[PDB]
Design a protein around this ligand. Sequence first.
Ligand SMILES: O=C(C[S@@](=O)C(c1ccccc1)c1ccccc1)NO
Ligand SMILES: O=C(C[S@@](=O)C(c1ccccc1)c1ccccc1)NO
Lengths: 306, 306
Amino acid sequence: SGFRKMAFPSGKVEGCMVQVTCGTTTLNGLWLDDVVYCPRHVICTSEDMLNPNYEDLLIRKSNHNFLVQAGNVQLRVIGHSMQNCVLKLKVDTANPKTPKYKFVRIQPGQTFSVLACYNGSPSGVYQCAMRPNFTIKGSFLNGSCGSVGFNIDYDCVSFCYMHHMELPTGVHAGTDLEGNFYGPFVDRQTAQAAGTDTTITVNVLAWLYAAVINGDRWFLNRFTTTLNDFNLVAMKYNYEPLTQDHVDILGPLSAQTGIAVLDMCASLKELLQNGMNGRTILGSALLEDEFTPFDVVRQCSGVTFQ
Amino acid sequence: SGFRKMAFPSGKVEGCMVQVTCGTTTLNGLWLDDVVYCPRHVICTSEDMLNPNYEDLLIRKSNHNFLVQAGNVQLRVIGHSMQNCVLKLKVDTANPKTPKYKFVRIQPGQTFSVLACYNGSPSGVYQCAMRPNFTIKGSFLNGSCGSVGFNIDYDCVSFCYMHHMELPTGVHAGTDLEGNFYGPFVDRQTAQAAGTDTTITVNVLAWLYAAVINGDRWFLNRFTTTLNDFNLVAMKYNYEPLTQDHVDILGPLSAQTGIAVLDMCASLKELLQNGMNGRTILGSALLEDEFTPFDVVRQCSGVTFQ
Ligand SMILES: O=C(C[S@@](=O)C(c1ccccc1)c1ccccc1)NO
Ligand SMILES: O=C(C[S@@](=O)C(c1ccccc1)c1ccccc1)NO
C-alpha cells in the first residue's frame, strides 16, 4: 500500500548520456547505437538565439567541431546532420550500453520520467506529464538541455522528450526525438507564451481510484452523473472534457473497485464545487493529474522491468 | 527553474538487486562484493511471522536452501549468517557491478531515494524521508521486502534503508544495512502502532526558500520572530522544535536569498495560523517537509554524480 509519484528506473538511460560541446556551448546528448542526438542550439551563442538561422550557422561547423565525451572517453564524430530541431552526430563507435529502445511522440495527458543531466552526468530523476498546452512542469537549470524523458515497457525504453527551452513563466518546452517541438514553440529566444493549463480529467479520476484502493474514501458520495452533465462542470473549472474513450480506459480501475466511472465523476464534481474542506487525498491537498490510468494499475500491481 | 520531488539516478543500485528465495518465500536482496543482504524473514512462512524464533528457524536452513538469482544467473551460496534483522549470504562471485558504497544510519528528517523492486527486478524510484516517528511513507506491495533506500555523493552510494514491514495503518518500517530497525519496530506480525507524525520544521523552511528562489513569494510578510516564540507555534501544530543547529544549516539558503532565517520562520508562523487561503506554493496546497536544506541547494545548483 501507499501511492507515490514514481519514476522509472533510470539506469538504462544513464548509460546513454554524453556531453556535447560546440564552441563555447556545452549540453547533453543521447548516444544510441552509433548516433548522438542533441538540441541543434548547441551551435548557437547567446547572441545567436535572438534570431538564429540554423542552416547558415551549421555551414561553419565540421565534424571535428562537435566534441562528444562519454564519461572520461572521447568519441570520434564522422558525420553530422540536422533533423528538424535536433542534430544527429554519427560516431565511429556503437554505444555498448544501448538498451532496446524506440522513439515515440506522446499525446497531451501522457506521463514520462525525466533524467535531468548536466555536462553529460546524471543529476536526478522525476516524473512529468505533457500538459494540454504542450509544456511540461520540470526542474531544469542552465546546461540541462538535451536531458530526455522516457517510458519503459519491460526491456524497451521509449524516448519521448528532449529538453530545449525554458519559457519566461518558468515552464519548459522541448521536442520528440525526431526534433519536432511539442506544441507551437520554437528554439528562439522570443515572446512565446503558454496557453491555458487545463487539468487532465482522466488522470484525476485514475488517481481517485488509486486513493480508494489505498484506503482514502471520504470523498465517495451518494451521487452519480452523466458525461454531458459532468462536462458542464469540467468546463467551468478548466478541466479537459471527458469522452467515452476516457471512460473505457478507466474500465479496469472501475472493475477492480466496483465504483462505476460515472459515480466517480460525481465525486469529482462535488470536490470541484465544494473543495476538500481542509482534508487530504493520498497526502495531497489538491487534485493530482499527473498519474495516468496505466500508471495507477502499474504501481498498484507491481510491474517490473528486466 | 522549477522544483520537483527528485530521486537520485538509480542505475548504480539497479546493478545490485537480486532475487532471494527460501522455501516458498521470495523477496529482494542487495549484492555488494561477495555478500547478499536481505531481510531475515525470508526464512519464515506466513504462520511463522506471528511469533518467530529466528535463531531456531535458521538452524533448519543450509547454504543450499538460499536460492539467489541475479537476472538470469544463479549465484552459489557458500556461507550465511544473521546480523540483527538481516541475513548476509556469502556467494562465490563478487558482484562486478558493485559501486563505491557505504552503510549509513540516518537521522529522522533526512531524505533518501527508494528503488522499489519485485523478484529482484526494479519497478520504480521515488524520494522518501525518515519520519520523526521512524516510519517512512512509501509505496510497497507484497514481494517488495529487501528493496533499499540510498543517497549518492558523486560516486559513492550510501545505503541507509532496507524495507521489511507494512504497519496496519499503511506506513512502512525497516532497517539500516546492519539490520537494526529504525524506531521501536520488530519483524513480527503483532500490534505495533506509529507515534505522532510530526512535521520536519527545518525541511519546510528549506522548501519555502526553494519557493522564493523560483518565484513563489506571496507568503513573505512584514514580520519577524524569535526561536522561542516560533516554537510555541510549532508545538501547537505538531511541528518539530527548531534549534540553533537548524538555523545554522539554513544559513546558506538565507545568504543566497537575503531573507533572515527568523524572518522566514515568521512567514511560516503566519501560514500555520492562517492557512494558505486556497493558494499554492511550488505546486502544492500544503507545506512540504521532505526536502532537506541539502536537497534544496543540490537541486537549485545542479550537482551531478559520475
Ligand atoms: O545551453 C543551455 C541554454 S538554452 O536553454 C538557450 C540558449 C542559449 C544560448 C545558446 C543556445 C541556447 C535557448 C534560447 C532560446 C530558445 C531555446 C534555448 N541549456 O542547456
Ligand atoms: O515477503 C513479503 C511479505 S512480509 O512483508 C511479512 C512476512 C510474511 C510472511 C513471511 C515473511 C514475512 C512480515 C510480517 C511481519 C513483519 C514483517 C514482515 N514482502 O516482500
